[PDB]
Subunit: 330 residues, 6 copies
């Protein structure tokens, strides 16, 4: 249902690498996944992470109950095998007949990065990249990948909560609220290279549109820096599979000191954000000046929506044209 069609051009994370390896005893998958209400299967065929529609072209069985055979995905029902382009190469019942030309299942751009598996459902605008994680490569940093966490909220609403400042005092009094710096500021926001960028005082955001946040917290550079990377998988209209990867300089402490803390603040948000109805933000919400980030976010998604209808070039401009508001130089 096509108010969300523009979302198909972006790269979305569907599972962790370790979720795929855990899925089937072979460690190759297949793993079933759902993205923007599409039912897909992921599997490692050879050296490629391949993503096809989880529906076989023959009698419509789910390839995710199949098995990986060599470099192919084998349907569990009558054993057809599919190659990295989703084409059937073996029909065991008539191995000497021709393979019908329609014996084919849709395939989607599937690439690994940062420890997660990303899928891009519609490549026809050739102008979106996998979101940016600042801490990959940086060898001073230890990187932990938390289990995915699922919310009954939309990627847009989850996004907005992660970049929200006004809510600390009420949802996170014990864990995030700084009573001396109690009231949030207004900050300039830049569009650059498909990302939103803004800073605090020091927290620095690089939000690859639509659903990814890259938050670099430094302790006025004195101590040492901490990076949060949080991206929402729009599973369906009501649901998100949410991924948090975090990196830290100070690696001497326990990973589960941080994992529990993150876990805690997410548990504080979840019941509120899930309560918001209607699940998608209607046009009768009343804002005030602290909501700059949420408004600017919605402004740009609307433009990306309209730009999409106009077509490829319009969308490329909408996404990548810079819109600088601050003094920082690019």
């Amino acid at each position: 249902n096509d108010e969300r069609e523009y979302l198909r051009h972006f790269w979305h994370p569907v599972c962790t690498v370790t979720e795929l390896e855990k899925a089937h005893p072979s460690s190759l998958g297949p793993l079933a996944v759902k993205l923007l209400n599409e039912q897909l299967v992921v599997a490692k065929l050879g050296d490629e992470y391949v993503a096809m529609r989880d529906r076989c072209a023959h009698r419509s069985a789910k390839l995710s109950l199949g098995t990986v055979s060599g470099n192919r995905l084998q349907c569990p029902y009558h054993g057809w095998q599919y190659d990295t382009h989703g084409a059937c190469q073996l029909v065991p019942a008539c191995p000497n007949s021709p393979i019908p030309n329609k014996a084919k299942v849709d395939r989607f751009d599937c690439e690994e990065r940062y420890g997660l598996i990303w899928i891009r459902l519609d490549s026809s605008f050739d102008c979106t990249e996998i979101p940016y994680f600042s801490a990959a490569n940086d060898p001073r940093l230890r990187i932990v990948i938390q289990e995915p966490y699922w919310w009954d909220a939309t990627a847009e609403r989850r996004w907005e909560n992660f970049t929200d400042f006004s809510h600390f005092a009420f949802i996170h009094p014990g864990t995030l609220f700084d009573p001396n710096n109690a009231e949030p500021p207004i900050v300039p926001m830049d569009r650059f290279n498909g990302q939103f960028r803004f800073v605090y005082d020091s927290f620095s955001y690089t939000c690859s549109m639509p659903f990814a946040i890259n938050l670099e917290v430094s302790k006025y550079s004195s101590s040492s820096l901490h990076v949060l990377f949080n991206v929402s998988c729009p599973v369906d209209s009501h649901t998100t599979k949410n991924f948090l990867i975090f990196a830290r300089e100070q690696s001497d402490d326990s990973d589960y000191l941080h994992i529990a803390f993150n876990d805690l603040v997410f548990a504080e948000d979840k019941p509120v954000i899930e309560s918001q109805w209607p699940k998608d933000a209607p046009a009768d919400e009343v804002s005030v000046v602290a909501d700059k980030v949420s408004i600017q976010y919605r402004k740009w998604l609307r433009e990306l929506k309209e730009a999409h209808k106009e077509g490829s070039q319009a969308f490329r401009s909408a996404l990548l044209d810079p819109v600088i508001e601050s003094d920082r130089s690019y």
Copy 2:
């Protein structure tokens, strides 16, 4: 859809008072309630039981997850606070900024009586009143408020089961059937003051429309009184939250003796009334002579539903115009 629109003009019970006090440790509420598919929140602000739509005007969190602070209801997300008129009176993020005029939520007529909280969603026709309970104030009687009991059944069908005389022999054979009173009488039924009134020998029904039933019983076992006040709340298309208050003259025995008995009668009804399908009674049900109470009630509802269409006064007339069939005065 809006075939139930007329029902919004009546007072409906949403919860017992204890339910609201129990809902949150402050004993002030808030408590969430569903009335005719509407999501509402109920709270004690100062001296008032207040009812609002359970949806914040900022970013649409459920206020039922919030907390009562002072004489206002404070949202869980960013702590906007709403007064007894549903107007925001504090935006914690910009305390030195003026509150938007649209920063308000719908408020509803909300009044406590008999130990229950009543809400009127539409007050425009200004002509409905909270059902009549005969045993309030009468200091000779001991009143008990059972816990709400829920049925997968509509308020109309719950009402028809309660005033039905024909089911005693079959659903309640060992608890309410009188062997040599096995065939039900046809009875005069008057409309007075927006109530149905009729008796049976005694059993004296005073049913404030649409969903309340007040049954006084001058026992053939006592020469002393016993009173059943039952009111169905239509929470949605398929289910009711049902309330039972009963008073008794012979107040010397255990409350639970009668509570257990009522609970058993309802247990005998419940499966059968839930089995009735469609949930709303269609035109092809075939009534008989002994269904006089069923018929008059469907007739009055149908008239009231029509009157609602033709506007305020035609409704006030269909409710309040008297119609006498028996030989009593009023």
Copy 3:
């Protein structure tokens, strides 16, 4: 919804006889059954098994919560009695007044055979008959009736699964796959007397349309016959209630030896056939040559569907007209 209407003309099994006896302590029933999204009640009235809409004419209660009384079915709410023709013959509340002419509930052809209760919702074409079980009569044979097994898949897909050959190697490797007889044959299929007939080499299939299969196996081991009779009740758009009656001539062994093995092959099919989506076979399924039985079955159903809209005798032609493709005498 008129897409499945032609199926109402066939006899469908809804329950075993032992199901009807177990369903109520009388052993006469009533038992609630669902067929083609119709809610029905079955009860034993005298010497007849009769079937009615499980919805009482009076106030729409479910007669399946009622009791059998002599030779009628008694609604649990107000006690109306319905005879074998679905006619109300007693109304307790006015046992003298005349019973209305609308005091009837629809009655459906219902007759027991093979230990199953079969229902024909539409009899206006008068050309359909209960499926053919080869092994009734045959006193050389022991007949076990397995308990109904439910799947989340449609009767057609269930059917195509039962008659499939290509799948043995992949979902039944250790239970049905013969490595010698590893690749599937294409074999003549006859239409005779409304049944599909075809044979293997020694497996003889007789398939009373649409959802019944009678398979005779003259195993390559001795002179010891085996018959499997499998038939799918289409209870709604997504689910089947399936029955299996099996007969064997080597009958000195335990029934549970064959029940376990039967159950195991069904356990292997189930997750896969259930996985198939959409539940109903769409036009974009790619067949190969080995799918002959599938494609001929689907083609015959289509003729039966479109014969139905023509009228009575067009259907009877499409169903019963012989169409023989092999050299066998009928």
Copy 4:
């Protein structure tokens, strides 16, 4: 613990035959049974039903997790095979070396009768036999074997419950109590051939000691006989596994008509008999005159207990010596 040792000399039922067949997909078993706090395994070896300690000689694994292999039982751990005499005849790890003389597990008299598997743990007295079911042979009769029902009560208390008369009015008011035959008779009891015999007026009891009851009912309605055969497996100190086989000559009705009614009377007994504490009847129980059957049963058990410590032929006397109290010919 030597308080219950005399019971090891009787045949006790441990499972139905259909239990043994259902317990493993071969239908040969093995099935684990518990009797008099002994853990046993039952399996079908060729034409014999054999019973062994469910504890393998080698490393003490449970043979009930094993498989039947030809005419032996195969331990699941290291594959030792035991024959009908409980002797190991194969040791895979050294199939040439001599099998030790201790490579044996205890074997117990085990023979099928009436559709049940019966076990005699001690055969050294050679004077006990499987209880007497009156209705085997009788081709006028249909014999139903109900599924075993478990109670948390001892076999004696189960027994005294079955033969009780005073309780009908209070736990079976609506199912067995006759208000005409309201008060219980005292009736002669004979000991003959190791059974208690007594009759009512038309109920004839034959009770093969200790825990079996054969009750024949020539009802006051016509010439239609009914037999109930009930027997308690003492599985430990606190619990019974009880069996009921029932036969009827009026056999045109459903089995489930009698199974439900049977089950209902047992449902009524169960909570009460289970409530009795201590589970074993202490000396301070106060009888009245109507407890004749109870007191004679308990007295006979005591003689059987103390005859046991004397030795073989003292027991056989106490058990089999006739002791007739009525005027009937044996």
Copy 5:
């Protein structure tokens, strides 16, 4: 097991009055209860709360599954009736025989007070009274009786927690810890009339030995007073059924404002107190000067233990001899 024998002379609460009325639809009971490992049944026979051993003298069935008939308790098995002295008065099976003299079940002192039902298992020292609740009678005070709450701890350990001062800072930081008055004092303790008495600054304890606490909190008499009455039922060696009744002057607020708060502080204690092992305080616990109350408590229980062995007069002295430590005059 007889380290706890002295406890049988005290009055113990076993249930609330409303627990007895809820237990059976008659509102008369019977209700089963367990005290110091004794299995008892409570029932209202006439105007008396009667308590007997929950074991019938005939065949050992539990009278708690019976019913109250007139002024008697009727066993559920064979219908014997027991009067307020535990004597059988009716044997329905031989209504014209003599009633055996042993047809009797033990009866125990059973009296209601404060809304609870108290049982005294051993009256032979005639020198213990039901604990003292300061707020009964006082008409300025509203009295609420919370549902009983069960802990896996002993009455002695639960007692000591309720009178503990040192633990606020750690188990109740959010709810009871007063940071300005952070460290506990040492207070003089008096023995008077079987009660311990001590005060704070103002909290005033009157602990009727062994297991009852009566805590009067006044707000330096300025505002208004609040009374907590908490008593532990020593169910068995590991378990307590705990009763809290509380009274307040200020009755204008919700009962469930206090009930939730109490509930909260109990939830804070429960997992700690349950963790203490061994469950009974062994002789190797190390005390410090803040533990005066716990030591003095243990000193007196030991003396009551020894006094009991010496006999009645010794015990009466131990319990009632005054031992004044403060200046207050008696």
Copy 6:
């Protein structure tokens, strides 16, 4: 009782390091653990993994419910704090009073190695060391620490299952059985340095007594290594917490490929080893030639158990004295 007393002199693993870090959000612990029926608490105080009895010296709360504060473990009840020696260093209630000398809890030898935490309950014989893991430090190998897996089985029987050669054909037929290596060899077994050593062709076992097993495998499938280190922890009379660490040379594949495989092997063992009864192997088990490893191990344990009785040095000798059967050097 103290037949397992000798086991207290060995180092035993109680938890993985992550288990301790995960146990409480601080990542410092505490974590409760049971070792040989002893209740202990483990925490990271400063630089040390500390193990104490999980029982406060004040009033016996479990310190595992407490929190780590500074370099001490703080009790949940009154907040006594214990240093790395189990001595209380702070009594919050009387900070200006001296701490009692008996205010201390038993402390135990506690050391981290290989990612597990080891405890030695008795250090008096000072002659045991933490088991040997061959693949620590070897930088060519990738080490994985599985989650602890629990078995209702003793450490002795778990060990015997792991070194057993005779069960492959039966418990693991499709996962570890080699068809033409179906009969197990008898092998030389040496005692060195308190370890059993033996090989099989290769498979090289190094089993530090009593419960550790270090198995190196130079594959016949690779010419590269794979290492299994398995150690059972006896938590009580009937159960074990089992640890598996494995290293591999070919580190290029998914950890989960092997994790899933190990988990499947254990799944095949588990039911069978749990079925073994009695839990501790009695003298009447009949061993055969192929049980050489079983026999030598029971022999060495029995000797060690005896040596413990005769004192420190006789034990140190029975553990450490070498005994060579093969032709290798050491």
